[PDB]
C-alpha cells in the first residue's frame, strides 16, 4: 500500500496534517497505531524513517496514522495547558480526532488504539497516555521526556523551549512525576495505558537523565518496582527493566545508542498485544 493524506478529519485545533497507511489486507476490526515524528520532521518523513512499521501493518492488518506538525519547528506541543490536558485542545486533541475519524471510517477496534513516537513524538506519546487514557491502550516512547516536564515552557523545540528538560536538568521525585500525570486529567478515576520507554546512553539531544525521570514517573503511576531485568534484550547493550507483573510498564536503556533509539517493531507490537 501507500501513504495518503486525509484532508478533513474533523475539528483540528492543532492545525495538524493527517496521513494514513491502510494495508491491502486489513483486519475486520483493525487496530490503529499513531506514529509520531520528531522535531524538524514530518509525517511522510517518519513513514520513511521507521521502515519496519508499514510492513508490520501489512502482516498484521492494523492501520497506521501519521500526524504531522507544521508549527514550532515541526515539533509536538507538549507545553501548553491545552495540549497537556484532557479535552484541552492543540496537537493532542487533533491527534485524538484523527483516531476517532479512523475508527469510524475504517470500523476499527477502539480498544486497540496505540501510539509510538521518537523524541518529540515520544514526548507526545506520553502526553497522549496521561491526558487520553480513555483513548489509548498502550504507548511506546523512544528517546523522550517525562510527561509535564515542559509545562509552561515558551515552546517545545530546540529553538523555543526552556532547555532544562532536554539538557537533563529537571529531576523530580516519583511522587512529583505521578502528580504531573494526574494533572493531565484532574479527577480522572481510571487506569492508564501500558507504557514502554526507550533511551540511549549516548543521546546528545535529549539527555538520558530523562530515562530515569520517566522510570520514576510511570513506576509511581502504576505502583510498581523493578522485578526483573534482561540484559542484551532485545539487542546487545539494551537492558530491559520489567516492573511489577510486567503488565503496565517496561523500560529499555541502550548502551552506546544516541538520538534516537531505533524502533524495535517486535518489542513494541508485542507490548501492544498485536503479535
Ligand atoms: C470520578 O469520580 C467522582 C466521584 O464522584 C466523580 O465526581 C467524577 O466526575 C469522576 N471523574 C470523571 C472524569 O468522570
Ligand atoms: C518498592 O520498593 C520500596 C523500597 O524498596 C518498598 O518500600 C515498596 O514496598 C516496594 N513496592 C512494591 C510494590 O514492591
Ligand atoms: C535539544 O532540545 C530539544 C529537543 C527537542 C526535540 C528533538 C527531536 O524531536 O528530535 C525538544 C525540545 C528541546 O528543548
XYZ file of C-alpha atoms and ligand atoms in Angstrom:
317
model
C 0.000 0.000 0.000
C 0.971 3.689 0.019
C 0.715 6.585 2.465
C -2.069 9.067 1.687
C -3.382 12.284 3.220
C -6.714 12.882 4.952
C -7.811 16.439 4.226
C -10.790 16.603 6.625
C -10.805 14.516 9.801
C -12.933 16.913 11.866
C -12.000 19.612 14.343
C -8.278 20.399 14.119
C -7.248 22.750 16.955
C -3.574 21.913 16.476
C -3.715 22.723 12.747
C -2.044 19.383 12.033
C -1.850 17.207 8.950
C -3.136 13.636 8.947
C -1.588 10.884 6.834
C -2.731 7.264 6.879
C -1.328 3.893 5.805
C -4.043 1.257 5.338
C -2.716 -2.188 4.333
C -4.274 -4.077 1.445
C -5.222 -6.956 3.767
C -6.972 -5.361 6.728
C -8.342 -6.920 9.878
C -12.139 -6.883 10.119
C -11.937 -4.626 13.224
C -8.426 -3.240 12.817
C -6.198 -1.794 15.486
C -4.823 1.726 14.964
C -1.240 2.806 15.697
C -0.432 6.517 15.788
C 3.211 7.061 14.765
C 4.621 10.469 15.736
C 7.581 12.168 14.057
C 10.269 14.119 15.869
C 11.219 17.777 15.738
C 12.126 19.131 12.306
C 10.436 16.070 10.777
C 7.135 15.276 9.123
C 4.519 12.565 8.717
C 5.956 11.461 5.370
C 9.468 11.584 6.835
C 8.555 9.322 9.751
C 6.777 6.911 7.407
C 10.130 6.577 5.632
C 12.253 6.667 8.811
C 10.652 3.692 10.598
C 10.822 1.339 7.631
C 9.649 -1.677 9.665
C 6.241 -0.247 10.633
C 4.368 -0.356 7.279
C 5.401 -3.982 6.566
C 4.199 -4.878 10.060
C 0.870 -3.252 9.209
C 0.796 -5.372 6.045
C 1.470 -8.565 8.022
C -0.902 -7.862 10.907
C -3.751 -5.877 9.375
C -3.626 -2.760 11.553
C -3.798 0.866 10.367
C -1.010 3.424 10.816
C -1.867 7.091 11.363
C 0.973 9.587 10.915
C 0.028 13.011 12.301
C 2.118 15.927 11.117
C 3.096 19.140 12.899
C 3.931 22.253 10.885
C 4.280 24.502 13.947
C 7.162 25.242 16.306
C 9.885 23.838 14.014
C 7.689 20.803 13.268
C 7.578 19.808 16.932
C 4.699 18.473 19.005
C 3.146 20.835 21.547
C 3.983 19.393 24.970
C 3.982 22.754 26.767
C 0.575 24.461 26.609
C -2.219 23.824 29.079
C -4.399 22.957 26.075
C -2.184 20.208 24.663
C -1.245 18.797 28.086
C -4.834 18.488 29.362
C -7.650 16.075 28.592
C -10.005 17.796 26.133
C -7.794 20.901 26.271
C -7.025 21.340 22.578
C -3.928 21.914 20.421
C -1.986 18.980 18.950
C -3.099 16.281 21.389
C -6.787 16.925 20.733
C -6.202 16.981 16.970
C -4.451 13.606 17.216
C -7.369 12.156 19.183
C -9.739 13.451 16.498
C -7.624 11.706 13.847
C -8.045 8.493 15.856
C -11.813 8.958 16.091
C -12.076 9.601 12.352
C -10.058 6.451 11.607
C -12.059 4.225 13.976
C -15.326 5.429 12.437
C -14.351 5.313 8.764
C -12.466 2.003 8.901
C -14.610 0.227 11.529
C -11.600 0.000 13.799
C -11.383 -1.535 17.247
C -11.499 1.351 19.710
C -9.943 -0.942 22.360
C -6.801 -1.311 20.215
C -5.506 2.237 19.674
C -1.808 2.741 20.372
C 0.822 5.410 19.892
C 4.564 5.368 19.281
C 6.983 8.162 18.519
C 10.567 9.353 18.574
C 11.962 12.290 20.538
C 9.299 14.997 20.211
C 6.879 12.268 19.107
C 7.862 10.214 22.164
C 7.101 13.239 24.350
C 3.663 13.481 22.740
C 3.103 9.726 23.171
C 3.385 10.230 26.942
C 1.047 13.247 26.744
C -1.488 11.024 24.994
C -1.030 8.379 27.709
C -1.578 10.839 30.559
C -4.272 13.043 29.004
C -6.170 10.417 26.954
C -6.016 7.088 28.847
C -9.639 6.687 27.702
C -8.411 6.531 24.087
C -5.046 4.742 24.039
C -4.401 1.159 25.158
C -0.609 1.348 25.010
C 2.255 3.673 24.132
C 5.902 3.256 23.126
C 8.102 6.315 23.662
C 11.538 6.261 22.001
C 14.035 8.793 23.423
C 11.624 11.227 25.051
C 10.997 13.285 28.202
C 8.652 12.621 31.173
C 5.107 13.950 30.846
C 4.751 17.552 32.042
C 8.441 18.411 32.112
C 7.820 21.206 29.579
C 4.611 22.506 31.197
C 4.648 26.297 30.872
C 7.672 26.334 28.572
C 7.512 29.010 25.833
C 7.871 26.270 23.218
C 8.552 22.608 22.582
C 11.508 22.775 20.166
C 15.331 23.011 20.403
C 14.945 26.692 19.456
C 11.924 27.736 21.533
C 11.645 25.551 24.643
C 13.225 26.027 28.005
C 16.192 23.702 27.502
C 16.345 22.363 31.076
C 14.321 19.254 30.182
C 16.329 18.298 27.080
C 19.557 19.025 28.968
C 18.628 16.595 31.736
C 18.490 19.355 34.349
C 14.967 18.592 35.615
C 14.763 15.976 38.351
C 11.638 15.352 40.423
C 10.565 12.595 42.763
C 8.463 9.692 41.581
C 5.533 11.184 43.516
C 6.010 14.573 41.859
C 6.014 12.981 38.401
C 2.913 10.982 39.333
C 1.245 14.250 40.369
C 2.130 15.624 36.934
C 0.332 12.712 35.246
C -2.744 13.324 37.402
C -2.731 16.993 36.351
C -3.350 15.890 32.744
C -6.917 14.925 33.717
C -7.830 16.205 37.177
C -10.409 13.966 38.753
C -9.817 11.056 36.349
C -10.649 7.840 38.220
C -9.438 5.150 35.829
C -6.411 3.230 34.615
C -3.562 4.230 32.353
C -2.311 2.562 29.164
C 0.664 0.212 29.079
C 3.811 2.360 28.786
C 7.087 1.283 27.151
C 10.047 3.685 27.163
C 13.446 3.520 25.442
C 16.546 5.693 25.650
C 20.172 5.600 24.540
C 23.038 6.324 26.926
C 24.851 8.416 24.285
C 21.914 10.684 23.346
C 23.284 14.226 22.924
C 19.892 15.739 22.019
C 17.622 14.525 24.832
C 19.665 13.732 27.939
C 19.442 10.104 29.154
C 18.675 11.547 32.600
C 15.167 11.806 31.166
C 15.038 7.998 31.104
C 15.464 7.898 34.878
C 12.741 10.536 35.242
C 10.329 8.596 33.017
C 11.032 5.475 35.084
C 10.263 7.373 38.292
C 7.091 8.750 36.689
C 5.469 5.559 35.421
C 6.646 3.263 38.199
C 4.853 5.675 40.538
C 1.714 5.849 38.354
C 1.370 2.061 38.436
C 2.764 1.497 41.946
C 5.465 -0.921 40.789
C 9.146 -1.639 41.333
C 11.596 -3.400 39.055
C 11.017 -7.138 39.432
C 13.115 -8.478 36.543
C 15.891 -7.289 34.257
C 17.071 -8.763 30.971
C 20.457 -7.923 29.502
C 21.066 -7.653 25.752
C 17.307 -7.555 25.285
C 16.205 -7.218 22.523
C 19.658 -6.307 21.168
C 23.179 -6.300 22.576
C 23.661 -3.442 25.017
C 19.914 -2.986 25.625
C 18.931 -3.523 29.260
C 15.225 -4.272 29.687
C 13.691 -3.392 33.055
C 10.406 -5.160 33.826
C 8.204 -3.699 36.563
C 5.659 -5.459 38.742
C 3.991 -8.324 36.921
C 5.075 -6.805 33.599
C 1.559 -5.763 32.569
C 1.919 -1.958 32.806
C 5.443 -0.570 32.432
C 8.771 -1.650 30.947
C 11.876 0.341 30.069
C 14.920 -0.162 27.850
C 18.280 1.598 28.198
C 20.558 1.067 25.181
C 24.303 1.309 25.791
C 26.129 3.431 23.232
C 22.989 4.435 21.306
C 22.328 8.131 20.743
C 19.462 10.196 19.350
C 17.322 8.200 18.802
C 16.815 4.562 19.761
C 15.652 2.863 16.543
C 12.149 1.471 16.797
C 12.085 -2.237 17.711
C 8.862 -3.223 15.999
C 8.635 -6.727 17.511
C 9.139 -5.449 21.064
C 6.607 -2.661 20.553
C 3.967 -4.756 18.777
C 4.249 -7.490 21.414
C 3.826 -4.850 24.113
C 0.655 -3.725 22.304
C -0.603 -7.326 22.190
C -0.726 -7.400 18.398
C 1.744 -10.264 17.719
C -14.508 10.454 39.293
O -15.402 10.071 40.340
C -16.011 11.184 41.007
C -16.825 10.612 42.144
O -17.936 11.441 42.457
C -16.850 11.982 40.012
O -17.389 13.123 40.670
C -16.001 12.414 38.823
O -16.833 13.006 37.832
C -15.277 11.215 38.212
N -14.383 11.644 37.147
C -14.685 11.549 35.845
C -13.635 12.035 34.891
O -15.755 11.092 35.455
C 9.048 -0.955 46.224
O 10.279 -0.753 46.946
C 10.127 0.004 48.156
C 11.512 0.229 48.720
O 12.483 -0.587 48.081
C 9.209 -0.748 49.109
O 9.051 0.011 50.302
C 7.860 -0.980 48.443
O 7.024 -1.756 49.294
C 8.042 -1.703 47.111
N 6.764 -1.855 46.435
C 6.395 -2.982 45.818
C 5.044 -2.963 45.165
O 7.121 -3.972 45.783
C 17.544 19.709 22.066
O 16.456 20.336 22.743
C 15.193 19.901 22.452
C 14.887 18.911 21.539
C 13.556 18.541 21.323
C 13.223 17.516 20.335
C 14.040 16.952 19.456
C 13.535 15.968 18.479
O 12.338 15.681 18.436
O 14.414 15.454 17.675
C 12.550 19.200 22.027
C 12.853 20.187 22.944
C 14.176 20.545 23.165
O 14.493 21.514 24.059
